[model samples]
Target: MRCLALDIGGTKIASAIVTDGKIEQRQQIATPQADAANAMHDTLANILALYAGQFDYVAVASTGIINHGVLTALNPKNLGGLAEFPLKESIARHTDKPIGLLNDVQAAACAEYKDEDKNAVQNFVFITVSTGVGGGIILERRLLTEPNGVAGHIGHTLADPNGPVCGCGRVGCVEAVAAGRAIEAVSSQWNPPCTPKQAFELFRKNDEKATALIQRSASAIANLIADLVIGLDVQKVVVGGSVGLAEGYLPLVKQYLNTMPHFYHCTVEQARHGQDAGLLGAAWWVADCLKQG
Candidate 1:
């Protein structure tokens, strides 16, 4: 099936035509901010027109919490203070094709899980340690998005009670401690001040300060993975995003995990899909949903 896939993130929205796990006619635009409340409708209109008559279905992988076809955020300010948006209604104004929407990370999980041995691994997770920490969970070979779309928002799980505040207004969320923004919160205050990439480079060179910062993030992620294993019996976890894939990062996470009990341990590895995971996952997930109907 031809699918018009939209991966909407905090900063940008990517659109593409996806078929059989392949992507084409991909395009990207800055997500409407500052005036998203008023500008989002027009943005959707333009995007729909751009791909008019080229697809059989629409699938959207969006940031924030998607519930009952409406979009919201744990911290509304994350979407430029967009509290509630009629996402499905906005799209319905454009086309009548079947529409599917879910959290972007959840969509990515579906993409990564597509190739997994479902028979051997019925429970799985995909964690992205990027600008913010995010995750998707697949249980019983099905992605979990139920009464509300808040299923896989594991990034908000507690990491350190004494840690800094998160963007979601929570105290010491994993994202607040393990996300790239979290690393920058400290690195940017160092004697020379550096970006996360520079910090990673210094870490690779064995700089004590950089190594400590990176280790802190990795440790939290390790704890998170363990929590998933013990709490939900996640069989395997695929870690992705900039920091998760950084040199000497996942090993640190594994090291921390190893320090825990055997029951908390599970196979962890880097994500297989790359930048297009969201797009392809959205397409694949929506297609599967349609098939179940």
Candidate 2:
């Protein structure tokens, strides 16, 4: 089946046509930040028009809570102050094809899970330490998004009671302490301000201050991974995103995880899908949904 897949993120929107596991006609654009709702409506309209009649179904992997076809987030304000967007309806306005939607990282998890040895790794997770931290969990080889589409929001789970307040209005969320934005919050205040990229460069050179900042992010991720292993018996974790994939980051996270007891350690690896995970995963998931129907 031909699937029109859309992967919506905080900063950009990516779309493509997928058949089997291959992607084609992929395109991307900046996500609307100002006057978001109206702008998103138009953007979807344009995208649908571009691919009209070229696909049999539509699947969207979005960066927020997707409940009953609506979009929200732990921190709605992070989405350009967007709240309660009628996601499925917005797409329906442009197509008559069947539609499926899920969180972006959830979709990414689906994509990565496709390659796993299901018999060995029945419980898995995909964590993206990007602009903000996000995760997707799979238990018994099935992605979990139930009740309120809030299943894999592990980033919002407590990291430290005294850590900086998260965009979600909670104190000490992992995202608040470990995400790229979190890194910038401190790096930008250095004696000579620098971007996270610069900070990472300094870290690679063994600059003490930069090393400390990166360590803080990595330590929190390690703790988060430990929590997942203990709380859900997660067997494997695949890390991605700008910050997660950055040089020297995964080793630090692994280093910290090693400090914990053996029970808390599971296989940790970098992502395999690169930039197309969301689109491919969304396509794979929706295809499975249709097969079951």
Among these predictions, the greatest lDDT belongs to 2
Model 1 lDDT tens row, 1-293: 89999998878999999989889998999888867867889899999999999999999999888998999888676666456898989999999999999998998899999998889999999999999998899998889999889988899999999999888889999999999999999999998889999999999999999999999999999999999999999999999999999988999999999999899999998888887888999899899889988
Please give the distance, in angstroms, between residue 120's alpha carbon in candidate 1 and its true position after superposition: 1.7
Model 2 lDDT, full chain set: 0.92
- Each prediction's TM-score against the native? 0.92, 0.91
Q: Tens digit of lDDT per residue, candidate 2, span 110-214?
A: 999989999999999999999889999999888898878999898899999999999888999999999999999999998889999999999999999999999
Write down the lDDT of every candidate, Cα atoms only. 0.92, 0.92
TM-score of 2: 0.91
Candidate 1, pairs of clashing residues: none
lDDT of 1 at 54: 94
Q: In model 2, where do residues sit more than 4 Å from their true spots? A: 29-39
